[PDB]
């Protein structure tokens with residue numbers, strides 16, 4: 001998160017910190033959010049050979065009793081996810097066991113477009129600048145929902161599939177390490193962080209989760 005503030009600790013109890021493991025390079029990191037006690041929603045580009053989920057975190061470098069480190073038993077990457085266009089960048093992670101509900105850990109379901117100009121909030125442990133490491137503490141930032149023409153330069157952006165997020169006048173933005181984190185508008189999840197420019201200039205592209213709620217429900221019911 002660039003240009004944000006430290007979250008009040010444990011004030012976003014659905015947030016998930018993901019470590020993405022692959023066979024041929026070191027760990028990478030993503031966000032996500034708990035939508036059922038045994039399912040986390042995140043981005044498809046965060047898929048790996050294995051993933052570990054930490055719930056209940058604030059400072060991710062300091063173990064505490066609120067942490068729940070949970071095993072992922074299966075990744076459900078959207079069947080139409082396209083590595084070239086980045087369309088359908090959404091994935092469900094099934095946890096081995098149901099998380100414990102605590103003050104610091106709870107679910108965020110979302111029900112069945114928010115107009116541009118509205119302000120929304122996104123949180124994450126991602127990089128705080130182009131040349132900066134991920135934040136040790138959960139950060140959050142208020143971003144403007146944009147008209148889709150603001151993201152035209154992402155040639156594979158599509159308004160019905162995706163949200164365009166972050167006024168280009170500001171440096172405020174989601175960034176690397178924040179993928180999969182939820183965008184909340186008036187307390188309701190509307191998007192997840194998908195991608196943006198390597199130089200961090202907003203807007204960034206978020207998956208429009210409304211479009212995917214039927215698919216999410218089909219995975220939840222079958223599993």
Ligand SMILES: Cc1ccc2sc([C@@H](C3=C(O)[C@](C)(c4ccccc4)C3=O)c3ccccc3)c(C)c2c1
Pocket residue numbers: 020028029030045046047086173174175176177178179193194195196197198200201203204
């Ligand atoms: C402004 C703005 C906001 C969010 C974003 S995520 C993003 C970038 C990205 C990475 O690099 C990682 C940290 C990543 C990659 C693979 C596995 C796990 C983690 C990630 O996320 C991206 C790459 C490949 C596909 C989609 C996104 C960039 C450049 C970016 C930029």
Ligand SMILES: [Zn+2]
Pocket residue numbers: 009010058064066
């Ligand atoms: Zn704590």
